[PDB]
């Protein structure tokens, strides 16, 4: 028997769960990675089959899990009717009230820390690994992710010190939104890249929010710009913006506009999704810096 400790206290899991609800946005990836097929998955975005993205889809096979959604909040009645022996909500934005409500249905694994959404991915992965008795296997999977990105650095020693920015694929009310240096950007550091500090003065929580008249100046501080774009229309809209259009990156073609899959892979930041980032992204960075 394993005992998981989290923000709301301890959860005792007597044996390996045969019925598992994934009540958060990204958890289905770590569960599938250790070959736990959830009976329910919670949709986030992308409108994927059964809310499982292409990298994890082969693991799903012919399984047809219920698809939940957080639009109105956690649907507990649906989770109750599914009658799970385990509920994983790390990423579901659980609070003290909703947790006890989930605990009534079955043992519930909540987030460990002050982040109700999107705690550091390794913490989420390790927690899931222990809960499903996959702990040794999960450790190997995490180590494999670090290996992949490190191998990119070794293959591209010239990239070291080059400045990059990781940006959302859409403007918010005319403003560029950058991912601040943190665990989310660690995969870029592993490749040897540095996050341009031009975004630091504009920091809000884990994101920089760039005023319009600061956009060109902030972008021009970077050698390569990675926009996480979910469709061709996202890219067109960004290139139509005069600040972005007049940036050095446009003239010098320093822009990387991700595919929906690539954006989703970054967004999920899982043991399954990150390997996709390590494969598909560096060839695009190579054409620019190279
Ligand atoms: Cl660590
Ligand atoms: Cl194991
Ligand atoms: Cl090689």
SSE diagram, text form:
Elements: E1 2-6, E2 9-13, E3 20-22, H1 28-33, E4 40-43, H2 57-60, E5 66-69, H3 76-82, E6 86-88, H4 96-105, E7 108-109, H5 121-131, H6 135-155, E8 163-168, E9 176-179, H7 186-190, E10 194-195, E11 203-204, E12 207-210, H8 212-219, E13 224-228, H9 232-240, H10 242-245, H11 248-251, E14 255-257, H12 260-268, H13 274-289
Parallel strand pairs: 3-6, 4-5, 6-7, 8-10, 8-13, 13-14
Antiparallel strand pairs: 1-2, 9-12, 11-12
The chain binds chloride ion (3 copies).
Notable characteristics:
290 residues, alpha/beta, Rossmann fold, four-stranded parallel β-sheet, 39% helix, globular, binds chloride ion, Probable periplasmic iron-transport lipoprotein, ABC_transptr_periplasmic_BD, signal, transport
Description:
The protein is α/β, with parallel strands linked by helices. The chain is built from 13 helices and 14 strands. The protein has 2 domains: 1-133, Nitrogenase molybdenum iron protein domain (Rossmann fold, 3-Layer(aba) Sandwich); 134-290, Rossmann fold (3-Layer(aba) Sandwich). The strands form 5 sheets. Strands 10-8-13-14 form a 4-stranded parallel beta sheet, covered by helices on one side. The protein is globular and about 60 Å long. Bound molecules: chloride ion (3 copies). One of its GO terms (cellular component) is outer membrane-bounded periplasmic space. This is Probable periplasmic iron-transport lipoprotein. Keywords: Lipoprotein, Signal, Transport.
């Amino acid at each position: 028997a394993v005992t998981i400790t989290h923000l709301f206290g301890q959860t005792v899991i007597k044996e390996p769960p045969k019925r598992v609800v994934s009540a958060g946005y990204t958890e289905q990836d770590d569960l599938l990675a250790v070959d736990v097929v959830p009976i329910a998955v919670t949709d986030w975005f992308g409108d994927q089959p059964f809310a499982v993205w292409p990298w994890a889809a082969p693991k799903l096979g012919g399984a047809r899990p219920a698809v939940l959604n957080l639009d109105n909040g956690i649907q507990i009645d649906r989770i109750a009717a599914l009658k799970p022996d385990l509920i994983v909500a790390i990423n579901a934005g659980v609070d003290a009230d909703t947790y006890q409500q989930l605990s009534a249905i079955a043992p519930t694994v909540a987030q460990s820390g002050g982040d109700a959404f999107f705690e550091p991915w390794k913490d989420q992965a390790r927690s899931i690994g222990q809960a499903v008795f996959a702990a040794d296997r999960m450790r190997s999977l995490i180590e494999a992710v670090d290996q992949k990105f490190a191998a990119v650095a070794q293959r591209h020693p010239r990239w070291r010190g080059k400045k990059a920015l990781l940006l959302q694929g859409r403007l918010w009310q005319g403003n560029v939104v950058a991912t601040l240096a943190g665990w989310r950007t660690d995969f870029l550091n592993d490749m040897g890249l540095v996050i341009a500090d031009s975004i630091k003065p504009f920091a809000v929580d884990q994101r920089g929010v760039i005023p319009r008249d600061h956009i060109k100046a902030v972008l021009d501080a970077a050698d390569v710009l990675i926009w996480m774009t979910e469709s061709p229309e996202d890219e067109k809209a960004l290139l139509a913006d005069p600040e972005i259009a007049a940036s050095q990156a446009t003239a010098q073609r320093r822009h990387i506009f991700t595919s929906k899959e690539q954006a989703g892979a970054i967004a999920f930041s899982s043991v399954l999704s990150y390997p996709v980032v390590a494969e598909q992204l560096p060839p695009q960075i190579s054409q620019i810096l190279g």
